[PDB]
Write a protein that binds this ligand. Structure first.
Ligand SMILES: OC[C@H]1O[C@@H](O)[C@H](O)[C@@H](O)[C@H]1O
Length: 322
């Protein structure tokens, strides 16, 4: 019986969102002096669960996992594996509607998320304002089955209903990848040309991919684009006028807090069974970012006040399901 191992599972190191997510976990392990293990699936749900199992075995269950499930289906099997191993796990973003932490006390510590319908409608509303409320819009979505992809898209469709002057030219999935969004933006410009008066992206990486295509056609900054994540590269694009808005989930914080909750549960520092539901399944507070407050968000992400000890400081409310 040695030290507890802290592990963080996520899709890829190529998306700055996860670069920070990983940084935060790394920083939390650092603070408590526990070994850290990053796990990257690279899009393979099969690899992600395989790795988690391999780790659960080498630690004899003495593990605290903070994972962002590749797909919502993966969440249940991961949670089942941790539960039988006696390990503790926290979920981020993706999970089935029926999967609740309170059904797996105390191993399934918590699920963290944000209201994608609200924020998606927020970035979409800002985008349409920029367009004068009229014009053609193309939209890039995340992995089809992902909960945030579904919610943010739902937020978009709602902003559209409130702006009948906006015409949705075409919605396409780019799986959160800028390299997949690039060629899609190109084909849209060839297909719709001047009809495109704006671009909505389900996350920053895809927006930057969209902006790379615009830049290649000398339109970067002339066609308003929005994203979500609030990643440093996304923030830079906002200060430069190329991205009109984004939403900061604070991946750094997400990465560390997830493990913090899990570790405190394992140490019996918190009484899981007695926590309100909104502390088990939480929608967290995020920061809408635009040029007016971009400088403040940038400064935050270079001098992060790692509030690991204050577990429920950002609980906006419980996760809701339409
Ligand atoms: O797994 C869900 C996450 O996937 C990331 O690629 C994306 O940047 C996040 O905003 C969230 O959608």
């Amino acid at each position: 019986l040695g030290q507890t191992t802290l592990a963080c599972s996520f899709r890829s190191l190529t998306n700055p969102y996860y670069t920070a997510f990983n940084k935060g976990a790394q920083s939390f392990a650092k603070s408590v002096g526990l070994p850290y293990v990053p796990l990257t699936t690279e899009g393979s749900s099969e690899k992600g669960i395989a790795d988690i199992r391999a780790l659960l075995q080498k630690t004899g269950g003495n593990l605290v996992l903070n994972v962002d499930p590749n797909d919502s289906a993966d969440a249940r099997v991961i949670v089942e594996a941790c539960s039988k191993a006696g390990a503790y796990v926290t979920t981020i973003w993706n999970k089935p509607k029926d999967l609740h932490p309170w059904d797996y006390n105390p191993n399934y510590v918590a699920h963290l998320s944000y209201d994608g319908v609200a924020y998606g409608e927020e970035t979409a509303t800002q985008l349409f304002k920029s367009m004068g409320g009229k014009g053609g819009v193309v939209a890039l979505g995340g992995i089809f089955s992902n909960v945030p992809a579904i919610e943010r898209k739902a937020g978009l469709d709602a902003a559209l209903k409130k702006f009948p002057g906006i015409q949705l030219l075409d919605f396409q999935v780019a799986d959160w990848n800028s390299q997949k969004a690039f060629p899609i933006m190109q084909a849209w410009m060839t297909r719709f040309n001047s009809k495109i008066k704006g671009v909505w992206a389900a996350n920053d990486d895809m927006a930057l991919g969209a902006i790379e295509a615009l830049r290649a056609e000398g339109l970067a900054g002339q066609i308003p684009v929005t994203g979500m994540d609030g990643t440093q590269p996304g923030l830079v694009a906002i200060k430069s006028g190329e991205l009109v808005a984004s939403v900061d989930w604070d991946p750094f914080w997400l990465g560390g807090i997830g493990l913090s909750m899990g570790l405190q549960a394992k140490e019996k520092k918190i009484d899981l069974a007695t926590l309100p539901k909104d502390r088990r399944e939480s929608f967290c507070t995020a920061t809408f970012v635009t040029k007016t407050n971009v400088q403040d968000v940038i400064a935050r992400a270079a001098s992060p006040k790692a509030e690991w000890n204050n577990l429920y400081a950002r609980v906006a409310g419980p996760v809701v399901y339409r």
